[PDB]
Ligand binder design. Structure first.
Ligand SMILES: Cc1cn([C@H]2C[C@H](O)[C@@H](COP(=O)(O)NP(=O)(O)OP(=O)(O)O)O2)c(=O)[nH]c1=O
Ligand SMILES: [Mg+2]
Ligand SMILES: [Mg+2]
Length: 342
DNA sequence: TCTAGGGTCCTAGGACCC
DNA sequence: GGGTCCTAGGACCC
């Protein structure tokens, strides 16, 4: 009962789309992100820009100090979305067991595919080809017996490549796998783990499960499992959006409620529009707001509420402003909704 | 250099129920 | 005291 799992992952996604649509962007360093003056960060960068050290999540300020000729694009989301719709129609030609993780990424469980003589490797290659014809965008892929290994595999041979891991390669693959490459282990976790001489899955193999649950709860089980190649999570295909939010970071910290209110007036129409798309009657489970202060502490307050409603979001924001700002400057105001359950 | 905006999932206490 | 809902917040992903 080995499953055949594919992870497909578009190369340089936003930047690739911008380079296809404008060829002159191809060989010069580019990134999608907001300007330095807008306090922006980098969404992604093309390869000529990564060469300079530009990365996603990097303050644009730093990107420019690292790469002064950086061309900065604002991003065209409908174009990325269009591409994402296309690559999912392509997957559906191969299986209906498709679990998208974002615009540019999806798991596929092809275990029971009678397609490329049942070869998970050919299906992958054939998906990547056909995405490139049809879209002029390259993708990379990872083939493995479980979700997370397929994900790690998809990074191993990018851009425009793939990587297969068979059950037989699994133990050698894990011995040296750093924990930080496990999805769900980021900076903080990696540092706590490294603080106790745990760097690889091989280090974790040697640990006791009881102590691991004691010092991490459910996370430590997951760590213990994945360190062993164990990942019983099924490719889902039935997931639904749970929430929607709209937030803006000001060029300068605000200090007056009039300013906050004015921000909210512009945020609201945008949230209404985006919600109307998926819930015309605007019916919801919870609505609330978000402030982030100059000490980067962020606070949210949200409450049960039957329908998107501007005035209540403003009143809630005023309470929050008045009750938990303690004279700090404010860098960010946000609106938020929790969707109904079914 | 100076730290986005779109989300998901998990944890933890009190309310509330039984 | 165990479920589960409510609200707040953190880590992480893309
Ligand atoms: C990680 C990340 C990605 N994104 C956007 C831009 C990317 O083009 C897109 C896909 O994410 P990715 O697969 O993590 N990165 P990528 O596709 O640009 O690069 P790679 O080729 O997959 O390494 O999502 C951000 O807007 N902020 C982020 O911090
Ligand atoms: Mg990608
Ligand atoms: Mg991705």
């Amino acid at each position: 009962g080995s499953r055949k799992i594919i992870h497909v992952d578009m190369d340089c996604f936003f930047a690739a789309v911008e380079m296809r649509d404008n060829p002159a962007l191809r060989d010069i360093p580019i990134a999608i992100g907001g300007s330095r003056e807008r306090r922006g960060v980098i969404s992604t960068a093309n390869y000529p820009a990564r060469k300079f050290g530009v990365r996603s999540a990097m303050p644009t300020g730093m990107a420019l100090k690292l790469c002064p000729h950086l061309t900065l694009l604002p991003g065209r989301f409908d174009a990325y979305k269009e591409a994402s719709n296309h690559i999912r129609e392509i997957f559906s030609r191969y299986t209906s067991r498709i679990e998208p993780l974002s615009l540019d990424e999806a798991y596929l469980d092809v275990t029971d595919s009678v397609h490329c003589h049942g070869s998970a490797t050919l299906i992958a290659q054939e998906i990547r080809q056909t995405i490139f014809n049809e879209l002029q965008l390259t993708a990379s892929a990872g083939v493995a017996p479980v979700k997370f290994l397929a994900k790690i595999a998809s990074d191993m041979n990018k851009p425009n490549g793939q990587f297969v891991i068979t059950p037989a390669e699994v133990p050698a693959f894990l011995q040296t796998l750093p924990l930080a490459k496990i999805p769900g282990v980021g900076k903080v976790s990696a540092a706590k783990l490294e603080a106790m001489g745990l760097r690889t899955c091989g280090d974790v193999q040697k640990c006791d499960l009881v102590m691991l649950l004691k010092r991490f709860g459910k996370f430590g089980r997951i760590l213990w499992e994945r360190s062993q190649g164990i990942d019983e999570r099924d490719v889902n295909s039935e997931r639904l959006r749970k929430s929607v939010g709209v937030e803006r970071t000001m060029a300068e910290d605000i200090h007056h409620w009039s300013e906050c209110e004015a921000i909210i007036e512009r945020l609201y129409p945008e949230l209404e529009r985006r919600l109307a798309k998926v819930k015309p009657d605007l019916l919801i489970a919870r609505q609330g707001v978000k402030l982030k202060f100059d000490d980067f502490q962020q606070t949210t307050q949200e409450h049960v509420w039957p329908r998107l409603n501007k005035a209540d979001l403003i009143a809630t924001a005023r309470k929050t402003w008045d009750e938990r700002r303690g004279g700090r400057g404010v860098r960010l105001v946000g609106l938020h909704v929790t969707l109904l359950d079914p």
